[model samples]
Target chain A: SMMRLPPARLRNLSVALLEKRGVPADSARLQANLLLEAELRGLPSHGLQRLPLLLSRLDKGLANPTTRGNGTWRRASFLSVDGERGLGPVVMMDAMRVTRRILKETGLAIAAIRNANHMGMLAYYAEAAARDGLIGIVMSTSEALVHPFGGTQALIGTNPVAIGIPAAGHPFVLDLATSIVSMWAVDRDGRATTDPHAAQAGAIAPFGDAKGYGLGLAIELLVAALAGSNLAPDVNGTLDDIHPANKGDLLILIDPSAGAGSIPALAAYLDRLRLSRPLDPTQPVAIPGDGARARRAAAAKTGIELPQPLFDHLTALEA
Target chain B: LYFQSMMRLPPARLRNLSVALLEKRGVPADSARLQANLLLEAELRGLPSHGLQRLPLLLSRLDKGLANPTTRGNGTWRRASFLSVDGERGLGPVVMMDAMRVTRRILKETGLAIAAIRNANHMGMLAYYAEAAARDGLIGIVMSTSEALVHPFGGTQALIGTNPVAIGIPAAGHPFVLDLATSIVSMGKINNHAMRGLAIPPGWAVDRDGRATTDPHAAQAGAIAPFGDAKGYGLGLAIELLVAALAGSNLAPDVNGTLDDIHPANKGDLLILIDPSAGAGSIPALAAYLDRLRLSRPLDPTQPVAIPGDGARARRAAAAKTGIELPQPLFDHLTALEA
Candidate 1:
């Protein structure tokens, strides 16, 4: 029930489909690349299936295709951004671009973003910053789909955080949801099931119990406090076309050269960790971004696999 | 038995003993008082490992010229809002208090600031500094690296520090404070069990051969487990890198002198302060939400859901009235040091 298409074919089809729906050529490519990168990294939940709904949102005026979001420097080191309902990756990248320009003078800068659509796979932006030889920290909030630590009710967001540190050979990238399992993986019975429909009614558990809950709540508070976004219980628009997105995103960038540490030393230490003694000798201790890069390399050679229905949907949309 | 050898002392009396011992070692009056306050606060909050028991070791370090008695720490402004400090072998609280003083002045104009410090002594109980920032109506984040004591999540070797992080946000009431070690438990707690002749719970640590251990002495020779498995390990590792990369301090494996008197402390500490008024949210709303969480129904009615710093606050309130209980040997050690 799946089809493997050449990477170029998929990319062109995705761009063509978005262009047919009025997304500009460059914007369409950027958006398409984000989706394709997620697919290449084996995160299908953030891959092609998301495009159809985005197209629907675009047709209905729920998503704005062109604006890079309006940004204002409220302080020397703070950039306040109103995403203006723009595509998530587009707005986020735009914010990063603006912050990078200011980081040379400030050495550290933060962008507090509100009103952007779903920022699929935060790792893309974190890695992008690392590739630029900067330390990047990113956090995004969503609709209330996760439960508090000891509570049964869904009263928190599946808040995710990503961090990237520049190293000697390759940068370190870490992306994880505060929730134990992603909300997309939860079933109605509160178990980790992959049925998409079950996620509509299920609640995800917070990762690492109370510690994870504390972190999730900290993100919730920090985003709402800084970005002026609504709290999780009152948030909407990220998952649907009925309302404008009210969620928030935070991106912080630091210039490593401005700090006192050595990037090469960081690389060597990470190598030590990778070569450490594992519980099973065959299974080496993995670094955060190592597996993703390996997966991407293999995925590039083999192309990407998509559910047949999704392939048909994109193809029909182009016509 | 040591349990029967415990004694209770007035908090003020213990504070006086600490202050007198530091002052006798040529510490300036205010610096001596600050050091005493840090230790006393730990004891008041029911964390005895960071309390008076550390005084003998700290005094020895001072006597041996490993810890400087009177240095406010030499600081240079690396950037407009970033402070880089060489702690000059000063006491941890002395250097930290100075950093906070300088950072607060910069935070007023920049709305945020960070200080990365190297060559400071052990910073006991990170919450002490976090709460101080909260009282000043600023959001504070503090992290410190120590000697290698924790094993990486799926590995047998002790390759990471028991990195601890503390956060304080200015809320309407008590100001939300959260402090935790990435490790499951502290080595201080393990040492306490050893002192009391108690067995550690399994899974708290692993032996030298990487086997799960319950014997406190054996666990002492081994490595503590990172809490929450891989997730916790990742967090601890991130802190390890942040401290070393930013503070220019030694990594966990190469770090030394925090728990001994033989070498200058090579660990790092970082503090970040941010003004809350620069943000858009209401402080009172955060306080109210926290109260609601506290009031929520619990599975066990006898044990209400507690916030991170709530237990410490309750314990401090009770300890202030009933006095702190210290082991007889620790009491004797402090008494001898004072003489």
Candidate 2:
């Protein structure tokens, strides 16, 4: 039922395995880090379990190991990055880099990238933005997987939105999928031999039923409509079955040390929160990234556990 | 102290008296006029906490120099379509109006705009601002972070504010507005219950020790439950990040005063304006879709079906014709205060 491996060894093995599968060294590292981070944070849904899907994507030539693409500015504060059909991690990293630079100058920057492959764990980009003292927001539109609030057909994407805020030492990050259960959850249910919800069910219950559905539509507008990407189920049949392109929108809000003094001011805000009185003694409020960091430390000592199938595949790669 | 302590004045009279009180307390006549208008409108529209009942708190804050009506934000910076306005320590209603005005003007040009205001006191009923934006045919999203009040998921303490959000979409008739507090109920509700010596509702609050309690007084001392558990907490947290952190407003924890104290608090508001015609051209389609959605299925037989804003709109219609009736006790309380 359980397969344990040293966290470092697991990460290295993942990277090596990905490299053997034609992923560039950096991409391999990125995917490995993304998986390990998800596992460490206890979100097994997107953890090492997604390795098979990622490998399948790589094998289909849908994901380029190294994405060297063109980024064109459509407006002063807006830029569109063409991923050149690369692995989502490479493309998204490049997008975030561009966004960080633009936001540094503009105070706020929005970047939308089209035609990129699957990007794992949105928190990666949000946390990256927070580390640089900017409030980062990331959202992506996927293929049809969720039904509208009341409609029987799967009319929208089970889109995810992630928001990250920088703290003194760590950042507070929130990442959630709009559906009560995401495609990953559906996949988990299938693995557990539970009857999966019908793909075209009348409605995929929202996180809080209807409220979550409304929020999901709001995200659809932000990520797909605003970005000029294909929306929901309408664009599902248009994509090639082998290589599914994902569309993403990223917004970054920069905190210039202009009004407030630089590092000291930044540290001041973070320190105040760290020392702020917690509401409950049993569970003291730790800054957002504190839990993930704590989890990483725990994983460092105790190693990580993966599904048996994933472990066997990893062992095959090691051999 | 019985329920009779609440003296409710006629909505119009309450409006005038609240304005007079603000003016007497040093608020500019025009600002006081607008604040009173907003409060009265809320009362007429069936929202009690935000109505004339709150004028006492506003006046007390003005008396203690905690609120300034005359203060105006110098519109400091502007991006392509976004603006950051410093509230300059003004009351929230004024700032909110200013932000909505910006949203209206910008939506006309770029089809969308985001207006964020900082350093303001508690804004009254968000539905007012949302309705204002909807009147102009723009979808409005309003989120604000208050002084710390609600706790995070799995925590017994109050670490975040009971942030409220309003999303309003325009229809052929009245706009569909979903305005709700992220908490099960606002702390203001607990105060209302305690004032009447009533027991709090079962799901409304938890004691200081994080145990669920129905005693209004104990509930006031403890943290209010977030709506729908973790779902509400996620929403409240998202609002904090959007309004406070993303907008570069006053962050939580550093904002002074906790919700336990019956005083005004500095807050932040984030407004997103969108014009549907620009891209989706789906207004009519969405409206039809909503209609079909309501009629398609009913999870409960007795309740049948209802949209988000149906009840509020019905209440407004009834009030507009008959004149909103105030509970005898609330009417007397206002009258006594006026005397």
What fraction of correct interface contacts does each candidate retain?
Answer: 0.32, 0.08
Give per-residue CA lDDT, model 2, range B195-240, as digits (tens): 7788977967778887878998988777776776666676687676
Candidate 1: where are CA atoms >4 Å away? Answer: A184-202, B3-5
lDDT of 1 by residue, B1-339 (tens): 755388988999999888999999999999899899988889999888788777888999999999999988988887766788999999999999899999888765676678899989988889999999988988888999998888888887788899998988877778777788899899888988887888999899988787889998888888899887888887888888888888899889899887788988998999988777766566777777677767654434576656667889999999999999999988987888777
- The weakest ten consecutive residues by lDDT in model 2 chain B span B255-264
What is residue A177's positional error in candidate 1, in angstroms? 1.2
TM-scores of all candidate predictions against the true structure: 0.94, 0.80
lDDT tens readout by residue for model 2, A181-275: 75512221112123455333334555665566666766665555345566665443113436456555544444433222133333465455455
What 10-residue stretch in candidate 1 chain B is worst by lDDT?
B296-305
lDDT, candidate 2, at A41: 80
lDDT by candidate, in order shown: 0.84, 0.66
- Candidate 2 residue-wise lDDT at A43: 74
Best by lDDT: 1
Please state the interface RMSD for every predicted structure, separated by commas. 1.9, 5.2
